[PDB]
Amino acid sequence: DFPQAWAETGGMGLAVRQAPLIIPLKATSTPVSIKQYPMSQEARLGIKPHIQRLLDQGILVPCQSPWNTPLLPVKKDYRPVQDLREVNKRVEDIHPTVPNPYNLLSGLPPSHQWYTVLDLKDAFFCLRLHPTSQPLFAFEWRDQLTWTRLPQGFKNSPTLFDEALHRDLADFRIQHPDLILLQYVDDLLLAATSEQDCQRGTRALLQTLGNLGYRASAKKAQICQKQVKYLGYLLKEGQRWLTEARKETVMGQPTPKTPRQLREFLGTAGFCRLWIPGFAEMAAPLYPLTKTLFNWGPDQQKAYQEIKQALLTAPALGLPDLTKPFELFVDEKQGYAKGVLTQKLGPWRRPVAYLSKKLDPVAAGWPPCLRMVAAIAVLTKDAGKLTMGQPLVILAPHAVEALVKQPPARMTHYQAMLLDTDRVQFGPVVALNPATLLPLP
RNA sequence: AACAGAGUGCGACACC
DNA sequence: GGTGTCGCACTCTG
Secondary structure: HHHHEEEEOOOOOHHHHHHHOOEOOOOOOOEEEEOOOOOOOHHHOOOHHHHHHHOOOOOEEEEEOEEEEOOOOOOOOOEEEEEOOOOHHHHHOOOOOOOOOHHHHHHHHOOOEEEEEEEEOOOHHHHHOOOOOHHHHHHHOOOOEOOOOOOOOOOOHHHHHHHHHHHHHHHHHHHHHOOOEEEOOOOOEEEOOOHHHHHHHHHHHHHHHHHHOEEEEEEOOEEEEEEEEEEEEEEEEEEEEOHHHHHHHHOOOOOOOOOHHHHHHHHHHHHHHHHOOOOOHHHHHHHHHHOOOOOOHHHHHHHHHHHHHHHHHHOOOEEOOOOOEEEEEEEEEOOOEEEEEEEEEOEEEEEEEEEEEEOHHHHHHOHHHHHHHHHHHHHHHHHHHOOOOOOEEEEOOOOOOOHOOOOOHHHHHHHHHHOOOOEEEEEOOOOOOOOOOEEEE
């Protein structure tokens, strides 16, 4: 039905509006041959059929180059990645344009709740390399070659491709303004308001992409769904849920017995902190067991449990509405700041994110009252990363508006941040649910 | 043994 | 007590 745009059918891609790239070198560089690292029978055999599939496909061509860098295949078959730090250090740097994965969804309007997701197959290869630059990307072989397209391992590949595709799509975006199109480099979210208003765009877009010369995986496609996985998340109805996959990777593991094992834990669980109320404080007992003896007392096990429990009971987050205002409820506890950034849908405050930070050494040194102010300060700063300086009412269990206006060091800076009334208004003192951190009637 | 971007915790150097 | 630059963990997205 759409043979052109499906990699599985319409064959390898080529960004047609995109003219072959010429990679600008450092003003002082020099070709570098580098000994093809040894791999193994499984690695050599892993990317073996790939280096052969690409060859007769033109993407790969017989070459004789000063430069050699060793290819570094991977897996999850194998990827034809290529270890080339030596090259891309001899290559100049460019002002980047890759999206901020943190706030991309901030731009998904609740009006739009019909979703499609298209992952792009072999995106980088859709860009052509200009024969001048082709040699930089050479590697030995047996059964020396090089890339006619844009290879993985190359430091600019990510940005170069974002721009290419972003530019190629700037057309669409103005022409179907009734649709939303988020783009994280390689893969795309389309948002409609209607089951068919989605199936239009998903026809148009899916077409445009075939024309422009890009191809999308029909395997990984997610067409006109009411919920979709995107960026590690489940999106459904303008809310962001943690994936059961994500959870299993924590629940599943055995209680850490080394610092390394602890670090992996805090590592992956910390990627869920937006869904864990008073996270930072929760994990306080765990942190010192990194770097340092490893005594696993009750507090360690308490934290450990609490955190895992907090994942099972984890709530959906509301996607930030930038056309509305936000409230930030905040509390401070023994040197730890915690709070929930919320927005209203009718009669409901619905959390947009949970924010917590360990109070730094000096702050932590100040008395309870002052601590609350610093608590309010950091979380406000962090909330900014989501609100985009949209107007924010700050609420808390202890009144502090006065003190930030009439204190008897850092204040100067805190006052500056908190007393800009064009973005920050204190609200009334309120009582919070100790869990959920929401206000009590 | 590769890249870009992101989250958070810890340290080091320097500076009044 | 305050304040500026780095580096090293673990983790995630593609």
